[model samples]
Target: YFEQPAYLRVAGDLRKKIVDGSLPPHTRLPSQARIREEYGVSDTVALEARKVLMAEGLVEGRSGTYVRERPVPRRVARSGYRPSGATPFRQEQADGAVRGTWESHSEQAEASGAIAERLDIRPGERVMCTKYVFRDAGEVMMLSTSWEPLAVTGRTPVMLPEEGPVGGMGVVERMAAIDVIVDNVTEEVGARPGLAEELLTLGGVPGHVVLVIQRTYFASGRPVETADVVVPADRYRVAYHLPVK
Candidate 1:
């Protein structure tokens, strides 16, 4: 087998040390010069190795890098839809014991190209956009941004997702009021680097990855609502429970 690159070799050794308790949490990592001397490598190799660790989220600190304390991830469950007085995010937590709270802001905006495609509407069309921040026991747990075509929801009591008579009742129930029955929903999950603003809101450092769920609700053959749910990858896991058909 071919030999690995010098930086990777060095990084692997350091990773082992960190993982095996030789280097505990908050322990200062060896300096670049020390790493170069110990590994018999150049400064470039040592720096690159440190960067690898940083990107992996194993270390932090700009003054001096240190091993980070890993947080145990919690589960966010998904199951068959059931109507409830609780908000959509509350249902995802699935545990009645864990208290959940959220705040949202809704406004009318022109749908961008991507969102328009998801809703099967023309770009620049007006849509009711709502942004939500959900918390579990005072800690931020998730973020969601949803878009509903104003052409369908405009002048309706449920136009604003978090206001009005049918507010916070969720897409299915709210749509039913207007006779737009949401019969199906589809979700696609993926991962990506967290945006700067999102990381700041979620208390994550640079290079952090976030899990995203792209969900859309369909009424018969028409899309009625689309949303993006974002959760910190290192702090939470998304679990699904599907019934066998």
Candidate 2:
């Protein structure tokens, strides 16, 4: 399992502890130096194990280079409620007049290791990253991103199209135009320290706080087209619905 570097066997042992409340949330992960000493693996294996946890939404990283605890919200969604599900997501809470259409052209980043594996790519591959802000009634709400491997998405080259994903024609769906069948999605949930931007999203008065959501997409199961979404603690809630076969 350690040899795979994508998922490991020992991760199950740790995951069980986390789910049962034995490890507890916000618990500091065993030091890399210490974990290597205990598990008899190199730094690579230790991090891979942690990726398994992060991808599973079991922990969050902090300023100290340590993992912190976060719990998902237990709120119920009322029937007939609707959200814009906006892309290029932005706007924490609107103040005076016009709603913020979009702010800060979406951010970009890459994927490596487990993150790449989830995308069916080699470690260190570049991903075209784009993030958005969600708002409602003139208030900022959540954060989210879209990813596409350079090799898979390079046909479009540098110019990322606007009004694509949100307008009902995103990269994932486009890929399907070529016969890439989307199968299923897996997601992770956790919190992150409040940032200057999140403050605007939540209408907070300048302080660090909790945010929670999932990094999800298609996997071994059918139901593809993946995503990672974030919501502020103050206004966030989730409902887990499992469909029986």
List, residue by residue over 58-92, the lDDT tens digit for candidate 1. Answer: 99995789999998888887543663465666645
Best by lDDT: 1
Q: Give me the displacement of residue 126 in model 2, in angstroms.
A: 1.7
TM-score of each: 0.80, 0.48
**For model 2, how does the per-residue alpha-carbon lDDT over 94-200 read when each residue is reduced to its tens digit?**
12232444432433456757657667776786776666665554565555555656665455533252434323334334555545554544556676677676566
Off by over 4 Å in 2: 1-114, 156-172, 205-208, 219-227
TM-score of 1: 0.80
Model 1, residue 68: C-alpha shift (Å): 1.6
RMSD of each: 5.6, 14.4
